[PDB]
Subunit: 462 residues, 4 copies
């Protein structure tokens, strides 16, 4: 076809990827419903979307939905280990520029993002951004400000990326408006919680094949990811302990039946080894970080962990674990891809039968995507139906074309209206075969809602 504008691991995997895409379409009714609803309208005609998000089968269905609605895209993954190579191949073989493979180096990861930004060595005529984690958003602001003049908006997938957007807005450096896709309930309380419930124990089993029942786990964090992670391990029969800095989230962990503990004596992290609860950490078989924070599994914790404990991170970035300390001081033995034994006996060489090692999964990167396939299609359906609606909304607002006085009034980080959140949810429920009841007019009046919704005030927490 003459198409060379891509870079994947193995284009010959395209047929396999296409078979899995066709299966995933049947698992994604909200996203496929949007394809059918908007195909004739072509609401993304003229949109040119820079996309940076895990190049999985689920992302493939998202891409082809955007394209079916009229958009053009240039795509990269937002993590070096999260691509499914057959997914990237199917997208490239469909004539869609994608630069992504499993097991990129840091230099290749940056090169891939740059290949979406540049076409034929010059800035692509981008006018929309879809991001997961804020890396593409950051590169555009620091390196390509002239490109942002013509971009109508950013739709950001995940908690960490939203935080970075809010920091830019606070400092007055955000250049285009954004939709916080993370905080739709059909994203945050579906993807972040239930997705990790499905995919955490999945990745741990694929990486180690360890029995989990009867063993001791420590989950650092009890937000949406930490809630789902803790359920992922508890439902397998693990004895799960939970750590938290937010006493409200800790209260939920208690009421949910977990013991709440701190790696530090009386919870005080003063940087000394004496502050580490060695008795507690010496009994832990598995530690999982879920925070989006820095260094919540630190060097002294790693030194105190029970021999042969598994260490992994399911937050967005690998700096939740002090893997730099481990690269500097301990010998790494690869078991298989994305599974390393870290030998605490020294830096130079190891004994093949040493018993004093840790098992690190995905080199500390997002373990569900690194060691398995991330969240399943039916969960990602909710997140990516929101993504498509967010893209439609900002592209139709046409921020880049507004006068400066109107731009100032629209430069914000917003969420989708609750009515749309509900409409995504209903398609998900129908996908399960669920039957929602319709309010009578008197019942709708009694609780103060329209029969068709929205059904809750914007303050409702679900």
């Amino acid at each position: 076809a003459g198409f060379t504008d891509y870079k994947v691991a193995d284009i010959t995997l395209a047929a396999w990827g296409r078979r899995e895409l066709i299966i995933a379409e049947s698992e994604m009714p909200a996203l496929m419903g949007l394809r059918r609803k908007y195909a004739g309208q072509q609401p993304l005609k003229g949109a040119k979307i820079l996309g940076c998000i895990h190049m999985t089968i689920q992302t493939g269905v998202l891409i082809e939905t955007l394209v079916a609605l009229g958009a053009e895209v240039r795509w990269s993954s937002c993590n070096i280990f999260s691509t499914q190579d057959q997914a990237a191949a199917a997208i490239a073989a469909a004539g869609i520029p994608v630069f992504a493979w499993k097991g990129e180096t840091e230099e290749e990861y940056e090169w891939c993002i740059e290949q979406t930004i540049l076409k034929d060595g010059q800035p692509w005529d981008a006018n929309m951004v879809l991001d997961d984690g804020g890396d593409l958003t950051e590169i555009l602001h620091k390196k390509y400000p002239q490109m942002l003049e013509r971009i109508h908006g950013i739709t950001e997938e995940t908690t960490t990326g939203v935080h970075r957007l809010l920091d830019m807005l606070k400092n007055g450096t955000l250049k285009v408006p954004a939709i916080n896709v993370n905080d739709s309930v059909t994203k945050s309380k579906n993807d972040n919680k239930y997705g990790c419930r499905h995919s955490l124990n999945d990745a741990i089993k694929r990486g180690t094949d360890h029995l989990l029942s009867g063993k001791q786990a420590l989950v650092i964090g009890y937000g949406d990811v930490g809630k789902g992670s803790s359920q992922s391990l508890r439902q397998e029969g693990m004895i799960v302990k939970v750590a938290e800095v937010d006493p409200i989230c800790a209260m939920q962990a208690c009421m949910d039946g977990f013991e709440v503990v701190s790696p530090y004596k009386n919870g005080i992290n003063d940087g000394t080894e004496a502050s580490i609860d060695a008795a507690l950490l010496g009994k832990i078989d598995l530690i999982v970080t879920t925070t989006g924070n820095v260094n919540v599994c630190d060097a002294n914790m790693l030194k105190a962990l029970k021999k042969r404990a598994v260490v992994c991170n399911i937050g967005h970035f690998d700096n939740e674990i002090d893997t730099a300390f481990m690269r500097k001081n301990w010998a790494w033995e690869e078991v298989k891809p994305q599974v390393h034994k870290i030998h605490r006996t020294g830096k130079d060489g190891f004994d093949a039968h040493n018993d004093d090692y840790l098992i690190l999964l995905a080199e500390g990167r997002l373990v569900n995507l690194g060691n398995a396939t991330g969240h399943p299609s039916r969960i990602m359906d909710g997140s990516f139906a929101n993504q498509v609606l967010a893209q439609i909304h900002l592209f139709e607002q046409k921020y880049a074309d507004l006068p400066a006085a109107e731009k100032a009034k629209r430069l914000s980080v917003e969420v989708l209206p609750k009515k749309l959140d509900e409409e995504v949810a209903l398609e998900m429920v129908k996908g399960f075969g669920g039957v929602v009841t319709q309010l009578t007019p008197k019942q709708a009046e009694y609780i103060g809602v329209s029969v068709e919704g929205p059904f809750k005030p914007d303050t409702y927490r679900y």
Copy 2:
């Protein structure tokens, strides 16, 4: 204790010593509430407060009452439900010299009389200046029947979802006369009391009323809000096969993901009024139906006619009109098994065969079943709710809304929630009561996620 004290009405004063024993146990189970008592007793922040209180007269409410008194308040108290009082709790409070008008098993006339006995003292309006309410009934009577009393009242602190809804409707219509705090929507209330409380107390009440095995049987929970979520878990953890109905697709999505089948009592979810719209095949398999919605007529007459023989029917929302019990009083014969447990014989109105097989079992005559057939939420859960109530009372009493000039009053006539910092401090005391240890952020960590080391840790938009 006070000599000659007669300003109360309870079922049995001889239960007071028993009630006091249970209050002393409950104090050990309520560290947030008792922490406020220790912290603020010397300051006496409620000195001069005269609180009208209307909330279920349980042992837990007793600990709330005596905390308010310990901080300087005078109170006059009634229950907000005819079946929810624990008579030993009411007796202990009356024996302490605190005016309380409450017993288990009031008539509706007695229920209204009890509220009016708090409102009046010696035949005339008490000089109340604060209101604590659970469901809005006391709020409604004051606005409807004693509007002049509201000229002296600084605020209302409302406990529960239904009460807040009524307050918001009044605010929208310009009929709310004093500011209010929505205690319900603290996270240490709504996502503790409403959910976890019902998880503890729903299966408790069904067991006490019926002693039915729940494992292996079929349940239908109407609603999947906070109460519906907790109720569904109460039954699923006993091994019930639980189906969930909802009108809200987001809540229905959560029910699916939580492992429940989502179904409607009506074919295709459409109630067209007729019996033909009822999914008779579904309802004929249900052993237990629980209403959790705060809405009206969500278990209606046609559903009751279609239910499986000998199914249990109950309501854990605030008001009994979730179930059309009036239809059942009109058409079917009631056989009392024991207090708050009735067999409802679908064979006819007049008599019943003592061995008739075609009956339903109704708990608490459709009133809040956890309080009607058991003791409601446990002390350690009510700790969170009632710590919020005390902080709410202190805040509004200190604001002195009734002493403001008319212009400044319109600026503060609002329904507010407590700030998140206080929500967190309540949660911290609850966690410590479990022996949990919260970790402290390092300065670099707190900078990294953009919070203070002391909190708050989440933006107000966070849903937990």
Copy 3:
């Protein structure tokens, strides 16, 4: 003019009858037997001494035995387990019953004796139904001439079966017995799932404590310990399990529980120093489930976290050293079957003392003492087995056999698997469950009959 009974309050009979009528609808296996055998009257001529918790469920059992032709004289096998409305309804029906909630030990003994004697002389009993062995022991020690005419004993529970097997081992057992406990529709229904239902039930009724998020220690992980551990874990407790049997301990681990010992390295040497004080100081609730003696001992009780709840769901109260607590500590009754035990001394207590334990049912069977025991639909299985066991031994007529034939039949046996399966089928039908029927080819393939039994006798389920 029926006076041959003693209950708390006969005016509770109408209430008891209402609850019996409900329970009948919850007990399809047992009522199925009532309907199937009523015309045949297989227990005509049976005269049954019965000793088992005088609950509503036992009421349905008694009236099934009577409906099948038997006469009975009844007592409870525990001082706190009677439901007074059940005893009243049975008495009001003209059935001799001696039972009330809150008996003294002297009254408990007197109640059993009133079943044994009628008009001051031995009743013409010829069958025994027992739960725990107390009636069986009194007959063997005190009324051997009565045992000469008794055809058999049907024994409900693990502890009573152990006592039977000891008698058989020693050559002191005088009549054959059926071990009803070890039907699968009893042991793996009643002992396990019944305790799942009623343990957290009784703890809530006695204390109204929140259980979610608190620390529990369950002593034992047999059938009762398995059901009890699930009762607490499903409420959200953090449950630790102790065991002496490493196979049961392995099951606890695989079921997601941490297995711990009250004693350092598991060595119970009798010293305070052997107590894992750090462990015991974390426990909010301890439950004993063993059928053994002193598995929650004085040194454990001294080390428990302040305000912990202590209770026992095994047959006898000696699982807990309550005698030590009576001797050393002050007891404050909260309400019936709930006591605070003040560890500050024996001579009085401060009403606001913080150093106390809460003891449920004075250490007696807590599900029956503080609630209503197992629910009717679970007891359906146990009591259908009891009825079938009574029929089997009564029809065998052991007492009428020659001495040489008695020696060949003096044993402790279980009911056959086909009966166990038929009880299970009625239970499943009560839930609306639909069992599949094997085709001839499938039955041939796995080597069973289409009607069962479906498993070899060695199968453990």
Copy 4:
């Protein structure tokens, strides 16, 4: 060394890394290595072994070798081998013939390669079997080899049934130990192993969300119990079918609805007997019975579009896959995952929506689409296997006089004391602490402080 056949010998280093890890996960098995290494109780044993050539089986093999045995090994299923485990064993100089993805013919050839060495019957004297295929081949094709064999140790429920049938028929030639019915096997492996590995295999094959979907589990024995839990703990709405009313009672009490694919449970052969409304709602069916044709052709026709079909019993005939080969078009998604298009036999529309997903072609799905049970669970089964091999080999049945052989030809289980000793090592691997009875407490309950703590009739 050339006496082996595996997929890729260069995987040996990888397999060896995973064996070193597995050793740390198998305390009972490694404890037997340490305690019997001095005695060498299997010196002189020549063991024919036929069981899934996994990493876990590699630790079993090297334990038998560490205690003195020679072995020749094959897998007992065409899809269960882990190629890196087989390579590590071959690279250790141990004859093994096994790879993932064998044909039926290759599977038989592999068993024959253990039986024969240099074109002649090996001088085998012990048999270790999982499912009875090797046992059957020896009896039917190499009966004279059985005159030198001291015993068989059989792993699984289906193989035990086959052994009992031969004993009843007078065709069993050597004594056997039923390893399945140790509690540390049956009530650990069969139940908890499937709890770990069923949802594992379904995720690896389909990556389907399981929460909120409907499952039908056929059977509720030990495998059906663990399978049902594997699905329910993920949030599936699980229904259970059973022919055994006692097992069905357990399913009800465990919180499951008990249903039959057939109206009133009567499987009369007609489409009319199928409960089409029930089957049309099922997203996943799992067979666990060890029986034949429990997911039959009419059920397959009635299933909800895009339902997943799989089998975790020993043999693939639980599902009528022959019917589907005969009538419907198979589209391979990836190895051991096939879409079966119900539109017809010859060809399919790539976008057809009327298909079912079959995992592992109906073969044991946990080993076919994942890695079977985890090391810490297989520890219990394989410690029992080692002990049973030691017992039968030391009994030396083949060397006994005829009348002594008649008294010794039986199928037995290991004593409870050994069962408990395996369990103790497993418990210690979790860090659990077993309490020791006092002498008074032991006397009170009528046991020895040493145990056994339960009568042989106890069901746990």
